[PDB]
Design a protein around this ligand. Structure first.
Ligand SMILES: CC(C)=CCC/C(C)=C/CC/C(C)=C/CC/C(C)=C/COP(=O)(O)OP(=O)(O)O
Ligand SMILES: CC(C)=CCC/C(C)=C/CC/C(C)=C/COP(=O)(O)OP(=O)(O)O
Lengths: 204, 204
């Protein structure tokens, strides 16, 4: 931890660039995702160390499942293992997404109710088979009964992979979020990417 | 000097003309005196969009929240939005104004434009968010029927004044929008800020 005057209460993480990162190392597109797991657990350890209270990760969307079977199997395998591995740490875990779909991994149904593991030092949410449209229409006030209601306002959204967009992430929680874009692919996560985001957040 | 030849152009551009106050404060003027310097920047962006063939542009006017600003700022920013709409109506715009008309803070002069109106040769659709609120927009539905339903998906959002936030502009229409932040304040608008945004959009 550098010393901070202020931290965001709730950080959202879009872990993008897994496929470009793979392709670049000479692998098949879908082999990138498994290299996204250790960076996830590293971001989480730092959040805990510096005192970030809540983190939401963009797992995958309904649209993402459109992609070829072999990519889908892989980024689903990586989400399961990611939630599995976060469960061995001190995390309050919540998975949000459309469970009324063959595309929601059965192995993650267990974490659709927020669950404390160890001391529960940081709330982790996970968007798995998430759709913005599914989310808003879930209600049909209604804004308090959206599918993503258990996930509060996002102060800071950090997106790896160089693209500046939400890709349909939590349009209610993101209406006022600061947005920091790291050009490096997610699997190239370094602590300094988080410290740079938090340095931007507080100097705002 | 020369107008860049783009491989690919967004069909719908969003503008967040921020920095009017900081701009004035930097010049030693009063906070409120910046807004009047916002109209030529906007008409010039309009004429470039007509030349390059951008079919649609939405401007973020003021939010419901913004009306609680010191009276002298609100008068200035209301008056700029009214000027901006009257002026464009003299230059071949199809104008649509979206905002909470059921409010004393909805400027009466813009009730003429709450249904989309072709003026002259209708060279580009221009939209204006006035007395607008994301919460008001979405709960209007009590999602084809949100207040802002006649404003389509945004391809590219360009914000002046270096803040990296959506500031509640059109949550639904901005879910997949590429976002480009110009650091300079809106009154310092340069054509090259638009070409920089377009070079960015093209490159995705
Ligand atoms: C289409 C044309 C011609 C131009 C429209 C752009 C204009 C005229 C801008 C000024 C009016 C406007 C939309 C104001 C928004 C309302 C508020 C409260 C804005 C906050 O002020 P700011 O963000 O400009 O100032 P700041 O960022 O604090 O320095
Ligand atoms: C939760 C966690 C930390 C896990 C990391 C991996 C993961 C499951 C996230 C990405 C899922 C996905 C469908 C992204 C596709 O783009 P891309 O980013 O893979 O590839 P591209 O940007 O190179 O096209």
């Amino acid at each position: 931890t550098p010393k901070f005057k202020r931290l965001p209460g709730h950080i959202a993480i879009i872990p993008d660039g897994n496929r470009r990162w793979a392709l670049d190392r000479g692998l098949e597109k879908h082999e990138g995702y498994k290299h996204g797991i250790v960076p996830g657990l590293e971001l989480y350890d730092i959040c805990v160390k510096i005192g970030i209270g809540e983190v939401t990760f963009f797992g995958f969307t309904q649209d993402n499942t459109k992609r070829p079977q072999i990519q889908r199997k892989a980024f689903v395998d990586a989400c399961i293992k990611s939630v599995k591995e976060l469960s061995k740490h001190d995390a309050e875990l919540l998975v949000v997404g459309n469970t009324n779909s063959d595309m929601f991994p059965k192995e993650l149904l267990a974490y659709t109710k927020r669950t404390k593991f160890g001391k529960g030092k940081v709330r982790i949410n996970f968007l798995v088979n998430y759709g913005w449209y599914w989310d808003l229409t879930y209600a049909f006030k209604m804004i308090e009964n959206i599918a993503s209601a258990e996930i509060p306002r996002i102060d800071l959204l950090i997106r790896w992979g160089g693209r500046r967009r939400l890709s349909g992430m939590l349009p209610v929680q993101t209406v006022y979020s600061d947005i920091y874009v790291v050009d490096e692919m997610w699997p190239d996560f370094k602590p300094e990417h988080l410290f740079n985001a938090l340095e931007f957040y507080q100097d705002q």
